[PDB]
Design a protein around this ligand. Sequence first.
Ligand code: LMT
Ligand code: LMT
Ligand code: LMT
Ligand code: LMT
Lengths: 19, 459, 172, 171, 60, 86, 63, 52, 98
Amino acid sequence: ARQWQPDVEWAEQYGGAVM
Amino acid sequence: MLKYIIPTIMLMPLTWLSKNNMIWVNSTAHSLLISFTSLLLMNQFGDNSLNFSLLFFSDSLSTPLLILTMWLLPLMLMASQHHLSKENLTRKKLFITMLISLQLFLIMTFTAMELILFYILFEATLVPTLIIITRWGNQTERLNAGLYFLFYTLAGSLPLLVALIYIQNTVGSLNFLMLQYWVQPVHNSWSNVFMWLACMMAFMVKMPLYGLHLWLPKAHVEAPIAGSMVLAAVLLKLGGYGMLRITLILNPMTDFMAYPFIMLSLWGMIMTSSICLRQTDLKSLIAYSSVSHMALVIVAILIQTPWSYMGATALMIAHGLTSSMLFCLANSNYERIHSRTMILARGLQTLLPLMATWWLLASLTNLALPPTINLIGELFVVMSTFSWSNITIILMGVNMVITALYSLYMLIMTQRGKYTYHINNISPSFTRENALMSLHILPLLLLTLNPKIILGPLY
Amino acid sequence: AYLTHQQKVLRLYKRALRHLESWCIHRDKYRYFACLLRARFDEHKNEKDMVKATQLLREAEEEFWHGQHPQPYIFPESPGGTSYERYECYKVPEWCLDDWHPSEKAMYPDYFAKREQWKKLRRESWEREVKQLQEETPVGGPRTEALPPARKQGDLPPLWWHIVTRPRERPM
Amino acid sequence: DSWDKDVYPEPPRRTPAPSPQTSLPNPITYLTKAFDLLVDRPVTLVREFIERQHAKNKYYYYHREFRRVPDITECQEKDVLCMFEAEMQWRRDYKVDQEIVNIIQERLKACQQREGESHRQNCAKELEQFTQVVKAYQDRYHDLGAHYSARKCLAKQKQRMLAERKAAKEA
Amino acid sequence: QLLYITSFVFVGYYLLKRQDYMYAVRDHDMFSYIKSHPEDFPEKDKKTYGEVFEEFHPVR
Amino acid sequence: APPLTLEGIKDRVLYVLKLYDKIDPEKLSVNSHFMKDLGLDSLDQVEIIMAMEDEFGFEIPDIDAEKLMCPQEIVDYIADKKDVYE
Amino acid sequence: DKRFLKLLRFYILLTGIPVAIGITLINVFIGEAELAEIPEGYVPEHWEYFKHPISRWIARTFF
Amino acid sequence: VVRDHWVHVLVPMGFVFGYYLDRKNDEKLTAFRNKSLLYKRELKPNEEVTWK
Amino acid sequence: RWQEDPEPEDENLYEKNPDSHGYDKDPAVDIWNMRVVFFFGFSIVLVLGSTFVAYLPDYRMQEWARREAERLVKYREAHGLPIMESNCFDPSKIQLPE
Ligand SMILES: CCCCCCCCCCCCO[C@@H]1O[C@H](CO)[C@@H](O[C@H]2O[C@H](CO)[C@@H](O)[C@H](O)[C@H]2O)[C@H](O)[C@H]1O
Ligand SMILES: CCCCCCCCCCCCO[C@@H]1O[C@H](CO)[C@@H](O[C@H]2O[C@H](CO)[C@@H](O)[C@H](O)[C@H]2O)[C@H](O)[C@H]1O
Ligand SMILES: CCCCCCCCCCCCO[C@@H]1O[C@H](CO)[C@@H](O[C@H]2O[C@H](CO)[C@@H](O)[C@H](O)[C@H]2O)[C@H](O)[C@H]1O
Ligand SMILES: CCCCCCCCCCCCO[C@@H]1O[C@H](CO)[C@@H](O[C@H]2O[C@H](CO)[C@@H](O)[C@H](O)[C@H]2O)[C@H](O)[C@H]1O
């Protein structure tokens, strides 16, 4: 199983106005 | 110590300037030569330690840890080069650079004569370890494992920094040799109680003390094999080494401040051993095994007897080689079935007969079979802790029963029984994998022939 | 229980006789009581009231539980017997032969030539076997674990490899 | 012999002469003769050859003698240069005194085996000398702790001396 | 690359010289002040451990 | 133990049936249905299986036993478990 | 598995056999130092306080 | 010397360089060479430093 | 949903190299990496390192202490002095409080 890397759902945690 | 520091740094140019296909050959070959030269540190004397210069010294406590540290670097390269085989070339060199920088900090940590120098190098190990886990870990939870590791350590280290700087202010020096002659007794006061806690709680977290141990199973489950080898073998020992040095200046207050932490270790070792019986993850079982084994070291260091320091020294070395071996053994399975579940791949002795011999040897050392140094260390702690209070023999005796139960249960679950029908990719053990286990078990067993060199300064 | 009433009585009969045989030991003694026990089953063999027959069975089970041997005889290779699973450590799966080194495979040039033919036969038959199951399984999936026989000539029964190629009971 | 018999004494060995009362031949006698010829002679010849090679190359090694230096009782407080030499001296004495207790324990253990069923009466001096030596060692070093030192050793002695002063002042 | 090394060494040399000088100044001030105020830095009458008393804490 | 053969298994399977008083040793053949041809009932079939179990020294589970209805089926079942291919 | 254990024996014996032979020759032909009293006014070298030649050589060379 | 195998001297050379630096540092710490109460002695006919 | 490489099927080194030692895909590198590990790891560190440890000169003066202890026991028994006296320091050099 290859190394996990952030997907879109993970990245969108950081795309809002606030955390 | 420059005869070891400089060669270790030279591993960086060697790796970076090596031909593309030779990075693993060159780094492993020359890191073994450095390990060979580390045997010159064993010019120990009965009375005086080996004091090279104003910055670094070696005594019978740091020498075995120094030899263990430098022996481990070539073993981590062997363990690492498989799962990194598809990695980008530059990122391979950076991974090897992180391991080299970790050895560099570690050998200086164990030889620093100044405690504030010790602290900086002690705390510098975090950076390479954190990077290894979070960058080359394979799962999502490697990011949380990084933060828990980071903030558990700093939570204790920052109080430690304040306490050390306070001690240099009032004593004038933090040179360890000076502190042996200028040490003054610590009297009862709330101020000295918190000075005691600051000086010790940073080391208790790295051991780890039961209660503060929950960062360790997280880190292990998420770290790559090389991160697990260094973390189990050496990094846990930083706390033990720090406690063996700092307790010099905490007497006689350690007489009553030890009690809560002995209770946590005496009870914690029974509970962590019992937890090992119900673990479903193989790496998590070995992690909880370390907590149980390191609780003996905390008890031994805190009761402060000649027999307890000899026992604690032997335990740290013996557990270092054993725990590293167990992690590598579980990794060899994981590289095949790509899972850490202990019950997934069973009856492996049928398919991998020689790897089943390594499993047996590793388990026997874990349960401390005489005359292995695992038992010698464990026995000396039991003998001295019995003198401390006879009732402890019950908890010590029970722990040996439980330790046998889960060590052989892990052997029986994965190696015996019927093999799993649908798992049909169990290829024969590679020469690389067999050599890796023999380099753990042979030196571990050889030290039985001459155990004095791992019994510390009170031998 | 999945078993019909008729199946339940028979399993009790076989179970009852075996525990009776443990008590008696001697064959002449066992023969005498085995015939008396068969008589008890033969007495109500024609009962037609399924409430009485069901009662007769339940009472019989209670009697067996009171009279069972605490240590009944077990065939050595049956579950619980002294030889059960004794040989599982000698059963190696056949896929292990793929990992043999060429020099190891060279000692049996004729066995490994036959082995390739079976592997070829497995490869060639698989697609048909999958198709046969798809076009015979009712919508929603199977309702039982029973598998079909082959219909055409030159077709092998679906899902046969791990049954045909399983290890021998005395593999070494 | 090859060690100092004074440090490791052994009473003279009294072995009774054979006085057989049986016509049969003693099996041990013949096995002794065979062992001597088969085992002892070739083993001795090899040793004698080796001891001839050693004779042609005779070199010496010495037992290190440490000069005495002022004790911790004569060191000014916090004077590391004088404290360090008194601490190294104290540690060498500590390691030597551990070996004296081992020599006496060895004498005691050898006596218990040598005397046999009579050891309780015949090993009274070895037992007495062991009891006295263990008392002295305990008074010096017991309970100092893992971080022991000449300072802690001295503090233990002073506390003991004060208690004994009150013992004499009380009577 | 040679200019990066040369410029760092050039600036570093003067920084090390000032660094050394400021530490020499600190010692010069400290020693003269000790000279100017004898009453505040009196020599300690140094007992030996034979004369000084330390309470003994057994490690039992 | 000495190895078995298909003809050896068939010889002993019939041998046991020939010593059973409810079966006619003349009407008996490898293909006789214990129910249709030999006239036996469910209870007699159970005892036949127990006799074969005692003959060859191994147990046949009830789930498998109830389906063995002719001597040939018993012979085939034993050979499969003993890996007899003759 | 067989291949690894042959390699393990070979590389262990590659230096093991030469070492075992050398130790034997050192013991037989050089021998061990003889305990002696320090001659008056003689200051021994720190490696002269050990008995075995290999121990003496280690002290002379590395320590 | 070969462009293939010149990197194999970096670490062996580091050991020699480190070993030499270790020896030099001992020169800065000769304040008590032949002055300790335990070990001081008169100098042999050609000796000039008891150790170095 | 979004553009992404599929996970590559796991590879077996024995597939294209039945003599593989598991170190590398290159047979020449694979044998070399094996030799440096076995030679330096076993021939050098473990064999010579064990021999070196076996012959360490009187590690922590354990032999010297026994020899010295023998010398003192011989002296004190010949001159009638106690083998070991409880006071570690000469009481003439001590000055008790009060
Ligand atoms: C006990 C002595 C030392 C204690 C030191 C404690 C300080 C805190 C250290 C960890 C800080 C981690 O900071 C943050 O914590 C939470 C949980 O803890 C994690 O979040 C995780 O747990 C929370 C709740 O438990 C879930 O809602 C979340 O889905 C999950 O991802 C974050 O991913 C991590 O970024
Ligand atoms: C991991 C958690 C570990 C918890 C460990 C708990 C240990 C508890 C230690 C209690 C001892 C504290 O120290 C104790 O208190 C005060 C210091 O303010 C001292 O006493 C001093 O303050 C008190 C104030 O009440 C005055 O009465 C007294 O006149 C004064 O001398 C005591 O003589 C000292 O013995
Ligand atoms: C085989 C593997 C062993 C590990 C590797 C060790 C290699 C070196 C081993 C032996 C080295 C020679 O060891 C050395 O021999 C000479 C004998 O000539 C001794 O020298 C001694 O005897 C000779 C005369 O015979 C004189 O110089 C003098 O009397 C004395 O110095 C040394 O004190 C010893 O240290
Ligand atoms: C005191 C310190 C001693 C340190 C010793 C370290 C030993 C390390 C051994 C590595 C040996 C590698 O030596 C090797 O030699 C050959 C020719 O010379 C080089 O060149 C080779 O390249 C490829 C392999 O990739 C071969 O197929 C080709 O036939 C050959 O030309 C390699 O690029 C080099 O890797």
